[model samples]
Target: STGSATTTPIDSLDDAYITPVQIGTPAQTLNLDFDTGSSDLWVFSSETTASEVDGQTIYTPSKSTTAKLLSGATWSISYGDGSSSSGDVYTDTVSVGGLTVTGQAVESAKKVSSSFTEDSTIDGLLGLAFSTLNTVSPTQQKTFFDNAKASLDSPVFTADLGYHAPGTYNFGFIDTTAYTGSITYTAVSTKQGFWEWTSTGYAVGSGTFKSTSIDGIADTGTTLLYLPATVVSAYWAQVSGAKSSSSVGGYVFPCSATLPSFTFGVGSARIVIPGDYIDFGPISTGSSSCFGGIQSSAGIGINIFGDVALKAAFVVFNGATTPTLGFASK
Candidate 1:
């Protein structure tokens, strides 16, 4: 699937695709990485070297039609992966997800690294997760989410992707009409937009399951759901009776068995991450063995709920009117 051609919606978007974001509205174009990992907004500027700026998107106030950058401010960020970039702080007009905000202060990295060029589809990752991680500088207060609050018709944002199309994922606005009556609600803790969850255990083919709850973060930046060692072990124990096939990352059991439902309780809302999510890719561990989920970061202190978990429900970040994440039917 790597070399085979893939279709993405990044290029097919309409006016609604490019939204205006700001770090206190601008005098220049602020190049930003649109990320959902954390709700942080920063960009690089003209002072950085070409090598550092190579893979990253940069913004120029002169080149933009409707944006401006703030004067005399500089900033940089270091990711958990030990990769980082730095540059001046500026504001600019940008577009994405079909909306625009004027004077949005953005972080600009002048010296961007080669890692950004790895994915042709991702120019930058937009932070739609929560407001806690926003990179709003003290000099330039506010993030894109802070400005776009009034424009969002629905206070919630949802991502829907057709497997064949990776970038086909769409965010913003919860389509409640798609689901049945009165959807459930969950109240998040005061610790930013990070979602803390409790798993009721997993069962394969309708057998008994072990119930558990673990605090984790929901992120769209990652591809799979990385769980705790105990959680993974308990899940595999259920299907030990069935023949297994190994996968490069996770595990998979034959569909023949009645794979019991895996449910997660978030406040008052209950979301079920489908069993099909575990069947992706191939087994990398054993011959004829399959993995439902991979064992990567078994001891990593951070718990991440990636796309596999996001697909199950519509997630909302209400930074404008209220700093809260609301889940409902999309």
Candidate 2:
């Protein structure tokens, strides 16, 4: 019963990756963001009001004979980025790559926030976080990964997120061929419904590595890397003209600056992020100033190792006993 799936990144939108999934009998395929920050298999559907729907593809349950409505079931979810969606529920055959889960709860969106509606390419979200975070009303629903774990040889999935390139999401088993060197393992605490881990310390450029414990989540849905305000200040202080700009909503610096590399401590393994990756394009149109991809997570309390950080390494989301994270160089 072991199987795997390969997911690719969206065109030029290196912020997040999308995977093609088949929903229902006739196989209504939808491109979904495989978010590890939340748990819910939601999609744009025929149930969505015409005006609420935009240019994205929709999943029609009526077209599939195997689709069954989950009577009285409903779901609502809101993200840290202010995107939200509310919808009814349906049970159908949902398949990712080669893995299939029959009678899976599919939250068909009837309402969506402007953030989702504006992103016409993102049809829906396939949550890979713990099932405890599911937003279904009455009884919580199991995520696609949770439902399919029992059938996998190892209760794990690997996220190979690349920079402006297509990456693969491996299920059922780990593909040694995809990564180089050794995969460093660290214990994770799923108490907060996320793949939460503690980073031992960090270093800027070739400076001394500090021993500070920073708690954060590896979020695929998030686009930037966030650290504590103090850490962010220290890192930016090294840059000659780097400063916090209200206009940019984060730190900004000259786009031509040859930035220093940043490194994170994961147990004994050190994951280094290139300076070029830290300079997140430009801050404004026709502007020479560029926004910093690494920012402060002050308000949120918990830091986020988003796409910018995850893309630097091959991540393993191990769901066995005490969930663990395995990291390796790509």
Candidate 3:
């Protein structure tokens, strides 16, 4: 046989990553994104006054059948990206998939940017990726996964990307039959919900950072993959050989013949980034100009393994009941 590839199927993602609870029955309906990199569930609400809430739909608690405000004072969250939002806290009966949890607290992000407010396909993100990021104290926490894990048929969750179309992402349970036997998973560090990341060698083909094995936390909230200077220089050197222009903004490869299937060893698992995933995006690297999903950032200190790496392996975040993550073709 010449070559047979893995055919990703098409499936509808219905189970909301986390059920949205309006601040005051249900005045607003917010679709949340499950992000583990941050510990906050916020939504744009019409109640905000400081800034303009434009095109984006804001949730109104008065419209929902079940809603309540958690007398808890208003809250504000500032992200590492320098973006911030402030809103009042509220609670209500929340449901995701077939499970329902009561008295769930949520923050209505009253002031949002044009990008966030204009996003129609996705409403807002629900940060259930880990419990540490939750507003609830670590000692008394209630995460989306924490409440639904015990009830799921399998105490596991899965995320699938590039399904149906490129840039399309989804999160759900893994099909037990996707792979053989039991799926091996690495445990999460207690400090934060992030997966402990350890790189084997930062290299591209023949280039690599001699004796530099960097370690950091993996982040899905961010888009690009970041690493130290040595790593970025080493990677750019090879692909940059075919460089025709330096200003292009995507990860572009040079010669097709030179593109190699790269592997980033995570613990005992060797997660490989196929040529296609690397070559499909906007080409901005060198002569090969192939900037698909993976790319470099301005300055690098942390090796944040964005969504590109997450959907590839069976990752388990040991939250309430050890929530396991694995791939199931959709």
| Winning candidate number (TM-score) | 2
TM-score to native of every candidate shown: 0.69, 0.97, 0.70
Q: Quick one: how many clashes does candidate 1 have?
A: 66
Write the residue-wise lDDT of candidate 2 on 2-64 in tens digits. Answer: 555656666554767888899998999999999999999999999887887889999999999
User: What does the lDDT come to for candidate 1?
Assistant: 0.48
Candidate 2 has an lDDT of: 0.89
Off by over 4 Å in 2: 11-13
Predictions: Cα RMSD each: 7.3, 1.3, 7.3
2 versus 3: better TM-score goes to: 2
Range of the 10 consecutive residues with the lowest summed lDDT in candidate 2: 4-13
244-319 per-residue lDDT for model 3 (tens digits): 2356653455444345544565434455555444444334334334454455554544466665555444444443
State candidate 2's TM-score.
Answer: 0.97
Error of 1 at 301 (Å): 2.2
Please list the residue runs of candidate 3 whose C-alpha ends up more than 4 Å from where it truly belongs after superposition.
1-29, 48-51, 135-141, 150-155, 163-174, 179-182, 199-213, 240-259, 279-301, 320-330
RMSD of 3: 7.3
